[PDB]
Design a protein around this nucleic acid. Sequence first.
DNA 1: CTTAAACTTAA
DNA 2: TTTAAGTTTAAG
Length: 246
Amino acid sequence: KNRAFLKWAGGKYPLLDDIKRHLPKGECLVEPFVGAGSVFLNTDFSRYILADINSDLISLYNIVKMRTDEYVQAARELFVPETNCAEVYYQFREEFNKSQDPFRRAVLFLYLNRYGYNGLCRYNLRGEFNVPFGRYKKPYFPEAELYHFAEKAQNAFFYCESYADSMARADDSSVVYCDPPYAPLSASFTLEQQAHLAEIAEGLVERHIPVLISNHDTMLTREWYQRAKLHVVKVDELLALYKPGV
DNA sequence: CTTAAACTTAA
DNA sequence: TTTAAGTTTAAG
Ligand SMILES: Nc1ncnc2c1ncn2[C@@H]1O[C@H](CSCC[C@H](N)C(=O)O)[C@@H](O)[C@H]1O
């Protein structure tokens, strides 16, 4: 399996084989919650539409795509032993938050992802990244993963927008895979948004556009995805397949 | 995960 | 004429 170059939630390498098992074939894959892009990186659609509400993420992806060698050379300079200390980390974090240059921000974003606590991406309400130092022994520089991402990205378009807007880009030749923020385990991304996502999926499948949604397997998700074909993986993971008729 | 700060609420 | 209690946010 191909690895994402970012530490990120939703890395589903165990679930990847299961996702692909239920992901229909098509010309184009639409991912409204692309995240680290594990599915994009491990499928073979002719083209991709990849979206996320995180603007730093989407900016980074197009920079890696379009300015690959330049980016790798710049980012690699930050993965040295001298940068692995709290004082340096918090200054790079400040530089990131004060920068208005997309390229420099994208370079620092990778450093912060690998040197910060548990690959978290957390902002305050003013849009400032505020994840603390991770105190790792030796962070890994994902050079190979970066180049593989860039190569695959030649057939992808990236959009910073919410799920409703990106799902509207789907057409008859599209397949849609949704990996929303997880629903609550026991009985931000709101419950209303969770239900709304399902409503959009129902609209798409009526237009003969297949939609696959992954989430926790709870009574609430089963109610949301009640019009889909439900598959349980291995709290368990739920795969909701909206499969068009004939 | 935790504590602290910011901010609102109620009587 | 006030402030303990709640709720949300910040950040190590
Ligand atoms: N309203 C929205 N529209 C599109 N993307 C969104 C969104 N809200 C959050 N996201 C993105 O969705 C991605 C989820 S990755 C999360 C995967 C997994 N279900 C988990 O919860 O851990 C994140 O990258 C986040 O930036």
